[PDB]
A paper describes a structure:
Phycobilisomes (PBS) are the major light-harvesting machineries for photosynthesis in cyanobacteria and red algae and they have a hierarchical structure of a core and peripheral rods, with both consisting of phycobiliproteins and linker proteins. The basic unit of the PBS is a heterodimer of an α subunit and a β subunit (often called αβ monomer). Three αβ monomers form a ring-shaped trimer, and a hexamer is formed by a face-to-face stacking of two trimers. In general, PBS found in nature is composed of two parts, a central core and peripheral rods that are attached to the core.
For Anabaena 7120 PBS, we modeled 48 APC αβ monomers in the core, 84 PC αβ monomers in the rods, 6 rod linker proteins (LR), 8 rod-core linker proteins (three different LRC), and 8 core linker proteins (ApcC). The dimensions of Anabaena 7120 PBS are ~540 Å in length, ~320 Å in height, and ~210 Å in thickness. But Anabaena 7120 PBS core has two additional half-cylinders (C and C’, one APC hexamer for each), sitting perpendicularly on the shoulders of the two basal core cylinders A and A’, respectively. Among the eight modeled peripheral rods, six of them (Rb/Rb’, Rs1/Rs1’, and Rt/Rt’) consist of two phycocyanin (PC) hexamers and two (Rs2/Rs2’) consist of one PC hexamer. The presence of cylinders C/C’ in the core of the Anabaena 7120 PBS provides additional sites for attachment of more peripheral rods and three types of LRC (two LRC1, two LRC2, and four LRC4) proteins are needed for attaching eight rods to the core. The rods Rb/Rb’ and Rt/Rt’ attach to the core through four LRC4 proteins in two distinct conformations. Interestingly, no individual hexamers of Rs2/Rs2’ present physical contact with cylinders C/C’ and the connections are only established via the CTEs of linker LRC1, which interact with both the first layer of Rt1/Rt'1 and the cylinders C/C’. The two shoulder half-cylinders in Anabaena 7120 only contain one ApcC each at layers of C1/C'1. In Anabaena 7120, we defined a total of 348 PCB, with 96 PCB in the core, and 252 PCB in the rods. In Anabaena 7120 PBS, the presence of half-cylinders C/C’ in the core pushes rods Rb/Rb’ toward trimers A4/A'4, and energy from Rb could be directly transferred to ApcD in trimer A4 of cylinder A.
Author numbering:
A (entry chain C1), E (entry chain K1), G (entry chain M1), I (entry chain G1): 2 to 173
B (entry chain A1): 2 to 214
C (entry chain B1), D (entry chain J1), F (entry chain L1), H (entry chain F1): 2 to 163
Write the structure that this text describes.
């Protein structure tokens, strides 16, 4: 579990030299964009369950053979395995957005997902679509201004689109 | 909530009866109700550190003062005491930052239940519960398992059940995993490299002019 | 490591639930604390040479026998005094690490874990580094709220030595 | 109950250590958040009779069958509608409780624990109270940062219903 | 584990009515004195180990029969039981100062201390004296202004002297 | 406590079996060892006032600052030197206890358990009592037989200090 | 778990003085009678299983109702409970003979035997009689000289008769 | 296996500590016991063909039906009597093993573990080998301390049969 | 856990014959050298902690990159691994010297040390060097006569130098 701060700490730690002024200035900018980071993380967990069901219907339409019999997500028990585990991507993504680093995302939700499926028979291709259907809706939920002050966070939202693309490409 | 993934069990030294009547190289498996002394309880409190953490990570700073006091008082059952060490955030930083989810199954079976895992498919089986229930909820489901409560009983320190010719588990399994080691080599800070000058080289602006004749 | 961002993360992990407003308020508390703590780290990194020279000479005047007594553990020879500035030069890194991280994580993971374990073996008296840090506590020269922030981690290391 | 003050306490208890600066910064994150949250609770307590009248009538117009279908579970009789204003009158207390406490403690301990457990038995559809809270989400009349903070506990209850 | 806030919450839950206006006026004052509460709690844990040893010497002088042979704190082991357990009063006191309530102090460090000593045989009065010794030094550490902004902590200070007096009188 | 009689007892207890010839041979190893040991304890009890006078003066000449430095921990005042002969007078009891018991039981239960725990707090350097015991190791006057057995307990205490 | 030696040690620790000369004179006598202590302990465990069955038949004759249906030792399962147990008295008695002290006998085999029977329904008299039928045969086994050198151990055999009488009277 | 040398080793292993004087005194109890036990083993190895002839004929005269009753379990045929001298020839090895090892290790690991387990299946009455060993107990011819040492392992095997 | 005695026992069990006369002649010699075995083992554990620190300084001088940052033994927790651990070689070596056999050394301290390091990143060669710095000092501690009777134990000390060389070569 690493931060943006402890990323710089463990990098400066190996050298054995105190952190440079330029590096510190960069971390002072993270303090200024710190309140926008709580704007984006609070907006996802408020719309957490609404974006799980909405990405599930768009997945199970466009691959109909899954809930069809013989499919990997056919019975009501496996179906709940998949439907509820779509939160576990979002659980570890919004950890990484609030952390600002992809270390927590890597060793919990990324380290064995491409591992565990060969023994399970769950298709790799299906996973790529589903998380990639979360990404265009999770970015779109945090994009629109309604009752918040207007700011610019395109340099910060691209981190969120990178986090889902890190989660997608490590499996499929 | 959902019932666990069904796993096939393999053949394992403890799964069956074996007709060893007490052998010497077998552990001294301790009990709380024998003690009646100052003296006995210091040895018993040390062997449970020696099981769940390991000898190497048995340093004083990690140890908890409140938990040790409880055993002497006897307010908490030793089985309730091991819950303190498994849900200790001094323990949690040492093992959960450094180990993946499937290794977290294997390490908890190898130490708390004192048994080898049967197969690969059952570390997958216990894995779903840990992510949802947390680390504490997976430990809580392991200690309140019927298998743990019948064989160790209520007040007996964890140990390895059958090791006729089997590796000690502390020696057998590292505190951390093979994955987290590869990160330590990746962030070694190589000296005299071209890679640490790559983020400086892109900041320098260079203009080149070519003439053709 | 321990950070009040990750303290909010690891607490919400064991319950298996989302980042509610309970864990979210722990983040801001770390954020606006950094602005009184990052220039608290800039006061130490700019004065790096001063303090490790100051604390090392303060140890010798407090304990005059540690320069005279023959032994590896002491500072009689030159390589002892070379290992003197290495040790207090290693303390000031972690204090600047734990000020920047905003928690006692790097003080836990890199300094005080097994610190009472090694000093029994190499017979390094912890009261040597107590007087070393107390010179840094009085000579830092920091002022205001930020100074107070740099003052606790010095005192948190002293209570770990004792 | 869960409070980011007591979240800092119970975390430091299991490690068996003092309140360092890690747990201390979680306190002032709760403190200055209350000043945008206490008048967020004053906006709900002053408008108490408006919202429970508004959300109850919003449920009937959304689901017109719940006033006509004969059953104890429904609002056909008078004691159903008497139990209608009791239920949404019970929701607004805990939201004002969890806004004042500053965490999702009272929402955990008093509302959502076993909330999916009882609704299977009494066949109360949770989508009834989803539309009830969504009327309160649009018509609470609060403005500013404080209103936004409150907005989360309404959405935290909705995700617990679904 | 209760707060000042959840004290009012669990009291208002029993009556079953909404939170009254003056209760929110009183809790708004706790927000204003919230930064002084972090001033007092941070000053104790910085001087934690210095006030354990200093209160121990004043105890073991004025009752010399304890470390004398035959005493309850004679041998090195028991001696470490008491010396280090003097932190456990301070561990649960500074929890209660930062909580602002005596509920955490009561069910951990107060609920069985007067219980456990009869079986143990430890003298109740001696422990009580030690607690008193801490109190006049813990108040005196947080009282003096050196490098902090001038402020009135008299209201806050009394609560701390009440917490040690709650811890003292429940045992002896 | 630990005694190679009771070491044979507690080992046979966990297996739940009778005292076979395995545990029985551990007894006569303790018995004929006592002849050397008992005499070895008589050499220390007769020379009781010599060694605590000798080791205390050996500490002051080894560490000359411990008589001059002002502090409770040191031996500047009279009650420090009164607590000096109490401490080394307490060491020689347990060595005579552990020689008579024939095991490291009383050294475990009465001296070294928490010995590294208290010395971090009261800043008593363990190298003080290292030189104190090393004077007793050279000046106890016992040679051969029980003395070799007697000496080990002096060296077993030194490795526990370090 | 205490010895004769650590009995003197823990007693001399409480007074906090050195070990006196006559205590070392008394313990030197225990060294001289140490080889007779291994004579008596080795003779019991060689005749361990022979004295369990022989004391069982004399018990179950003279109280025939235990054997008879409705009795506490009727079925083959309970019967093995009692039969198996009669070694556990002898397991902890011969520990105490080789220890020379009754501390190991007290906190394992004596501390809850009179406790555990009210919940179990096992009568007190049956247990008391059985232990006392072991004692006159265990003394008689160690008494007779056949192929050993003749010595005097009446001051040592009376310790064994005291140990069974300690085990008997603490239950019935 | 169990040996009072290795009994001292495995006990010090679980505590994770060095070989103190507690475990060390268990060694010389094994050492000087061997000099009364090794010629106790020489009395059995020299008389090997006497005792297995003596104990086998002692069994037949004690139980006269075991030579007449038709069955594999009995000694009616020749291969029964060939398996007769194999069995008691196997007992005298382990007694000489456990006398030389000085503990009940080889008696535990090689003879009595599962000895009551097999005799229920093959209906071999253990009272057959009780009278077999009791002939060896009276006919060994050993005298002095060595006889006493060779006498316990015979009686330790008898109590394991019953 | 095997002895020199049970080495001969388990070897004579496999052939299924009685113990031969020269094997008892060889084991009678082990009785005569049994008192020299006790002294050597006892001496090591008296100088146990002094030889751990002394071999540590000679290791961490001659490979300075270990306690330098980035090294495997840089931090204190890791450092208290490589230092305390060095007792665990000596714990299992002096077991094997008092056993007189290398069976206890093999299945505890040798069976997985060359295994566990590939997953750990610790350098096997460095550890081997450290044990080889113990060996020339452990032999030198037991060699010198000061206050003991003079004897000859070169045929016994070579077993100790074989035990460290067994421990060294199985890892590096
Ligand atoms: C979803 C898009 C696809 C899918 C999901 C699915 N998975 C399973 C079974 C498991 N899923 C996991 C996943 C994880 N375990 C972890 O620890 C983490 C990180 C915290 C993750 C992401 C595991 C271990 C299993 C095994 C069983 C378990 O739940 O504990 C199922 C159920 C399948 C079954 O029961 O056989 C489903 C439905 N499968 C699909 O069909 C989608 C394509
Ligand atoms: C932990 C509790 C907490 C929250 C939630 C919080 C949020 C928060 N977001 C703010 C600002 C802001 N937040 C945003 C965020 C965005 N605007 C966009 O158009 C983007 C789509 C989006 C980012 C993806 C912006 C643009 C501002 C402008 C002011 C600023 O820069 O802070 C501010 C400034 C002060 C104020 O609004 O009163 C607050 C309070 N503060 C708190 O204490
Ligand atoms: C990264 C954090 C970190 C620190 C700070 C650290 C210190 C540290 N200093 C040590 C020794 C030492 N430390 C010192 C330092 C001092 N002694 C004196 O005389 C002076 C008073 C004082 C310096 C001001 C010396 C001289 C040694 C060598 C002592 C010996 O070899 O016995 C040792 C044991 C041997 C070693 O590997 O060199 C450690 C582990 N280790 C760590 O991992
Ligand atoms: C303190 C927080 C809290 C709340 C809010 C709560 C609600 C709650 N409402 C219930 C039933 C009910 N809830 C309602 C309410 C409604 N049904 C309708 O038709 C309308 C659409 C709607 C009101 C707008 C009715 C009519 C019942 C009785 C249904 C039955 O008896 O089957 C029940 C089950 C039976 C009961 O004890 O009365 C619970 C537990 N419980 C709690 O502890
Ligand atoms: C006046 C000087 C003095 C002190 C200070 C003293 C304390 C003291 N506390 C003890 C025990 C203890 N003390 C505690 C206290 C606690 N454990 C917890 O986990 C709780 C949080 C906490 C109470 C709130 C406990 C649990 C014990 C266990 C032994 C007993 O019951 O006495 C003992 C038993 C003997 C020993 O430790 O050697 C001592 C000496 N004795 C003295 O002579
Ligand atoms: C001797 C009696 C006494 C006390 C106790 C005292 C405390 C005290 N702390 C203050 C401020 C403060 N105190 C803190 C302390 C902290 N904030 C954090 O978030 C950190 C975790 C923590 C430090 C670790 C802060 C941040 C302020 C802001 C105002 C200032 O800079 O003084 C002030 C400014 C004036 C006022 O509050 O009215 C007072 C009075 N003054 C007194 O006369
Ligand atoms: C039964 C075994 C046993 C021992 C040995 C023991 C020692 C011991 N010595 C102490 C203090 C002390 N120890 C000393 C001894 C010394 N300081 C020096 O300056 C000299 C170098 C050195 C003597 C050679 C002194 C002077 C004090 C008082 C220090 C103080 O009050 O701060 C203390 C703390 C306070 C006390 O109760 O008196 C303990 C526990 N306790 C035990 O239970
Ligand atoms: C388990 C506790 C224990 C120990 C440690 C022990 C050692 C021990 N070593 C002895 C003898 C001895 N030990 C040695 C050992 C050596 N001499 C050399 O010059 C060599 C370098 C070295 C062997 C490598 C010698 C030469 C003797 C002479 C007497 C004899 O043969 O036993 C004796 C004979 C009796 C006595 O000294 O009083 C004892 C007691 N006895 C015990 O009960
Ligand atoms: C019937 C009453 C009675 C008893 C009990 C008795 C025992 C007895 N055991 C003796 C000797 C002995 N007894 C033992 C026994 C052992 N040593 C060990 O290390 C072994 C573990 C153990 C055997 C398993 C030994 C070794 C001796 C040495 C002297 C001898 O050979 O008799 C002697 C010799 C004379 C004496 O000690 O004064 C006596 C008296 N004599 C009696 O008249
Ligand atoms: C190394 C120590 C050792 C011993 C001693 C041993 C004995 C032993 N004897 C057996 C059978 C037997 N044992 C005997 C011996 C006898 N039956 C009689 O009628 C006579 C009274 C008596 C000989 C005096 C016979 C005849 C069998 C074959 C019985 C059968 O096959 O059912 C069996 C079961 C079958 C087998 O593998 O042959 C074992 C395990 N096993 C061991 O591992
Ligand atoms: C009973 C036989 C046995 C041995 C020997 C053993 C070693 C062992 N050493 C370990 C770690 C370690 N081993 C070392 C030792 C070293 N690293 C260095 O830098 C030095 C070069 C070297 C010492 C000379 C250190 C420092 C660690 C901690 C590394 C970490 O935590 O990542 C670990 C993994 C974590 C642990 O529980 O502490 C094992 C299993 N385990 C066993 O069961």
């Amino acid at each position: 579990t690493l931060d943006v701060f402890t990323k710089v700490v463990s990098q400066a730690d190996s050298r054995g030299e105190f952190l440079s002024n330029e590096q510190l200035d960069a971390l002072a900018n993270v303090v200024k964009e710190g309140n926008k980071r709580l704007d984006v993380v609070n907006r996802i967990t408020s719309n957490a369950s609404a974006i799980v069901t909405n990405a599930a219907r768009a997945l199970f339409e466009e691959q109909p053979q899954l809930i069809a019999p013989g499919g990997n997500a056919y019975t009501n028990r496996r179906m709940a395995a998949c439907l509820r585990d779509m939160e576990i991507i979002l659980r570890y993504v919004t950890y990484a957005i609030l952390a600002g680093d992809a270390s927590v995302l890597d060793d919990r939700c990324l380290n064995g997902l491409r591992e565990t499926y060969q023994a399970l028979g769950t298709p790799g291709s299906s996973v790529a679509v589903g998380v990639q259907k979360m990404k265009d809706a999770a970015v779109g939920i945090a994009n629109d201004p309604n009752g918040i002050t207007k700011g610019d966070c395109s340099q910060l939202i691209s981190e969120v689109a990178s986090y889902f693309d890190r989660a997608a490409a490590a499996v499929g | 909530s959902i019932p666990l993934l069904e796993y096939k069990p393999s053949s394992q030294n403890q799964r069956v009866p074996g007709y060893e009547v007490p052998n010497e190289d077998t552990p001294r498996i301790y009990r709380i109700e024998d003690a009646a002394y100052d003296s006995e309880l210091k040895e018993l409190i040390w062997a449970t550190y020696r099981q769940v953490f390991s000898e190497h990570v048995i340093l004083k700073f990690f140890r908890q003062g409140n938990l040790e006091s409880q055993l002497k008082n006897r307010a908490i059952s030793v089985r309730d005491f091991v819950r303190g060490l498994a849900k200790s955030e001094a323990f949690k930083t040492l093992v959960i930052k450094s180990n993946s989810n499937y290794r977290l199954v294997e390490l908890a079976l190898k130490r708390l239940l004192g048994r080898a895992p049967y197969n690969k498919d059952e570390e997958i089986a216990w894995s779903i519960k840990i992510a949802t229930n947390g680390w504490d909820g997976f430990v809580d489901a392991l200690l309140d398992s019927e298998e743990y409560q019948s064989n160790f009983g209520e007040n007996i320190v964890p140990y390895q059940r059958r090791r006729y010719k089997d590796r000690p588990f502390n020696l057998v399994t590292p505190r951390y995993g093979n994955y987290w080691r590869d990160k330590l080599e990746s962030e070694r800070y190589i000296e005299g490299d071209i890679k640490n000058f790559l983020e400086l080289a892109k900041s320098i602006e260079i203009k080149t002019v070519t003439f053709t004749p | 490591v321990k950070t009040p961002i990750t303290e909010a993360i690891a607490a919400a992990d064991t319950q298996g639930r989302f980042l509610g407003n309970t864990e979210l308020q722990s983040a801001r508390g770390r954020y606006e604390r950094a602005a009184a703590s990052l220039e608290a780290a800039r006061g130490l990194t700019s004065n790096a040479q001063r303090l490790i020279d100051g604390a090392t000479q303060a140890v010798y005047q407090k304990f005059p026998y540690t320069t005279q007594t023959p032994g590896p553990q002491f500072a009689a020879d030159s390589r002892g005094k070379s290992k003197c500035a290495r040790d207090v030069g290693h303390y000031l890194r972690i204090i600047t690490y734990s000020l920047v991280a905003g928690g006692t994580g790097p003080l836990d993971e890199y300094l005080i874990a097994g610190l009472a374990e090694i000093n029994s073996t190499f017979d390094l008296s912890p009261s040597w580094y107590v007087e070393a840090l107390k010179h840094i506590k009085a000579n830092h020269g920091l002022s205001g709220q930020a100074a107070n922030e740099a003052n606790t981690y010095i005192d948190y290391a002293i209570n770990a030595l004792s």
